[PDB]
Write a protein that binds this ligand. Structure first.
Ligand SMILES: CCCCCCCCCCC(=O)N[C@@H](Cc1cnc[nH]1)C(=O)N[C@@H](Cc1c[nH]cn1)C(=O)N[C@@H](Cc1ccc(O)cc1)C(=O)N(C)CCc1ccccn1
Ligand SMILES: [Ca+2]
Ligand SMILES: [Zn+2]
Lengths: 322, 309
């Protein structure tokens, strides 16, 4: 029942030139308020540009210097200079470096030692030294290591055992053992199991059902029952469905129309819902969702890594899906 | 003011953040840092580095303060956290800090923490951060699963928004009946409770999801007892009644199909096929899922027909 109603005058064509302009100009208030996530913001902007064939409009040399300055003595990478290292921003940094074929700008051996150090006895990962445990971090750890060619650095069976202990009655996955299923965590856990070659442990028909039931009459996807749709679920939900070989279980035309309706025709960018304020986060996940759905003006995107497939082909890191 | 005090807030944030980082680099782990961060974290609780600062400050002060001074600091921190949660109840950073804090206390008051969770869950029964925090508290206080099961019942019965409650039951029930797939008497009682819910509100998708699980949690069909056989047949007729009252209700159509599968796939093959047609008309966005399900069932029926002597 909770849903949006799309206005008859919502955008209905893809505005690639406006979105590239929006990102290329971005950060030239919520920007200073968001310095605490700056590394991820940069990853969103760069990746959406590259999917649109416009990466060259961004400042490579400036970003490489910034990344090097955000690596701490422990090997971990922070969101911004002087902030504390975290697995979230270490992943964003490695994703950025992979896009730029510049991994050796940072100390890879220390990144690896940082990731290794955060794994717990039960196979879980903490986000940083303060000990928060989330399957988001199991994904961050294995994705970082896969991009670096160092997955063998962690205890992979124990990591699998922990993720699997987070599987629920409905076929999904939550934060931690006992936590309710949520699309964000499902994306993280299916991506993890792709990376570690364990997709046969997923109940693809049951989870695929739960995921396709995220699609509301508006065409948008929510992240769990009885919530409002948000265009970023075009990523979390669709990528998971693609990992598990069930992307055809949603109505692609309806979802495409919802995603287009979230564009701001005057500023460029995508918002969480039609008519809302845009941001670079929803711009990436809108465009990436469209790419999953097969939009010809956008490069094919990796459902596991949320980076152009051509980049992953380059590093030879392409997990088999269902 | 709107687009003026905008810049006032930003400059205050910029300036305070500024000061926190200077003090930190200076090694000044003091109450001034707690004052500065309280200013920032209430508005932006996802600024993790500043929660980290507060922990560093508290850790340092613990070493250099009387037990009574340390106790006062802890109580002020609990109050700060509670004020932050009121403003933003879905911040990972805030809930984490509370857990970090409670985990380190000499004599934590876990019953007060469970009551905090009840209050938050009255305001948003789907707040998964609060449900996870409750599970943490319950484990620390060794609260028994049966009491947590009593809690979920009250929640499911007093109003809807129940997916988080049903989820929690699916985790608690196997703990009361722990095995290296529920006992039949438990399953029968759960089927009764969920049938109650979805007939009481046929639009309650949470009860249908949980019921699908129940229908797989048990016997095997050639293994149906006469009581379970009878109960599943009763559910089937009750769903047909509902379908009459709510002919746009797709959950009840799906559930009819699943019940027939649970009862006897081959005997109900014709009706199952009829129901797929009806369900696809009613829930067109799921047509591809429904066709794959039907294909899976038809293949299973082939395997069953071939098993014939
Ligand atoms: C993209 C490639 C890999 C990245 C994987 C790492 C974690 C992914 C998390 C999955 C997830 O939680 N997805 C959603 C769920 C949601 C959607 N709507 C509400 N919840 C999600 O990402 N939520 C956002 C917040 C949001 C989205 N829409 C409205 N609000 C979120 O929690 N974002 C975090 C995590 C993140 C980090 C890097 C990245 O590439 C993608 C996500 C975030 O952006 N940061 C910077 C962490 C600090 C933070 C947390 C919450 C809010 C603000 N900042
Ligand atoms: Ca350039
Ligand atoms: Zn979103």
């Amino acid at each position: 029942q909770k849903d949006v109603t799309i206005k008859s005058d919502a955008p209905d064509t893809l505005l690639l030139e406006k979105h590239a302009d929006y990102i290329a100009s971005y950060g030239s208030y919520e920007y200073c308020m968001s310095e605490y996530l700056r590394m991820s913001g940069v990853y969103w902007g760069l990746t959406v540009m590259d999917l649109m064939g416009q990466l060259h409009r961004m400042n490579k040399e400036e970003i490489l210097v910034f990344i090097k300055s955000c690596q701490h003595e422990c090997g971990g990478v922070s969101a911004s200079i002087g902030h504390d290292p975290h697995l979230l921003y270490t992943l964003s940094a490695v994703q950025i470096l992979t896009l730029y074929d510049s991994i050796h700008v940072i100390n890879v051996d220390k990144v690896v030692a940082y990731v290794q150090s955060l794994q717990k006895e039960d196979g879980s990962f903490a986000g940083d030294i303060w000990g928060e445990i989330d399957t988001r971090f199991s994904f961050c750890a294995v994705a970082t290591l896969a991009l670096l060619g160092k997955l063998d650095a962690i205890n992979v069976e124990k990591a699998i055992e922990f993720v699997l202990s987070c599987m629920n009655f409905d076929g999904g996955f939550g934060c931690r053992p006992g936590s309710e299923s949520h699309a964000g965590q499902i994306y993280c856990c299916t991506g993890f199991l792709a990376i570690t070659s364990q997709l046969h442990q997923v109940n693809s028909d049951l989870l695929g059902w739960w995921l396709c039931e995220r699609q509301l009459p508006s065409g948008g996807l929510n992240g769990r029952p009885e919530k409002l749709p948000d265009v970023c679920y075009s990523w979390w939900v669709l990528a998971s469905l693609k990992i598990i070989g069930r992307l055809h279980w949603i109505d692609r035309e309806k979802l495409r129309s919802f995603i287009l309706a979230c564009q701001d025709e005057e500023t460029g960018g995508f918002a969480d819902r039609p008519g809302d304020m845009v941001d670079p986060f929803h711009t990436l996940f809108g465009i990436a969702g469209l790419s999953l759905l097969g939009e010809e003006q956008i490069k094919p995107v990796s459902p596991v890594f949320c980076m152009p497939e051509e980049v992953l082909q380059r590093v030879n890191v392409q997990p088999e899906l269902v | 003011a709107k687009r003026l005090e905008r810049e006032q807030k930003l400059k205050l944030y910029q300036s305070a953040t500024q000061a926190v980082f200077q003090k930190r680099q200076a090694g000044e782990l003091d109450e001034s840092v707690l004052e500065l961060t309280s200013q920032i974290l209430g508005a932006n609780p996802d600024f993790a580095t500043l929660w980290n600062c507060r922990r560093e400050v508290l850790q340092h002060l613990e070493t250099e303060k009387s037990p009574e001074e340390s106790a006062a600091l802890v109580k002020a921190e609990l109050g700060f956290l509670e004020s932050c949660l009121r403003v933003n109840p879905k911040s990972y950073g805030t809930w984490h800090h509370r857990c970090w804090l409670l985990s380190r206390l000499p004599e934590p008051n876990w019953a007060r923490e469970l009551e905090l969770c009840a209050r938050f869950l009255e305001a948003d029964e789907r707040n998964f951060h609060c449900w996870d925090y409750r599970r943490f508290v319950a484990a620390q206080a060794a609260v028994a699963p049966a009491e947590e099961l009593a809690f979920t019942d009250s929640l499911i019965t007093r109003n809807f928004s129940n997916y988080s409650s049903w989820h929690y039951r699916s985790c608690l029930l196997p703990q009361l009946h722990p095995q290296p797939r529920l006992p039949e008497n438990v399953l029968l009682k759960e089927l009764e409770l969920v049938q109650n819910a979805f007939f009481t509100d046929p639009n309650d998708q949470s009860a249908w999801f949980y019921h699908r699980w129940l229908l797989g949690a048990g016997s095997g069909r050639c293994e149906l007892s006469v009581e379970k056989s009878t109960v599943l047949q009763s559910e089937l007729e009750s769903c047909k009644e509902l379908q009459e009252l709510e002919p746009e209700n797709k959950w009840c159509l799906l559930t009819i199909i699943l019940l027939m599968r649970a009862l006897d796939p081959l005997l109900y093959e014709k009706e199952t096929l009829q129901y797929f047609s009806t369900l696809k008309a009613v829930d067109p966005m799921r047509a591809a899922y429904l066709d794959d399900l039907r294909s899976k069932f038809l293949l299973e029926n082939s395997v069953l027909k071939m098993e014939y002597a």
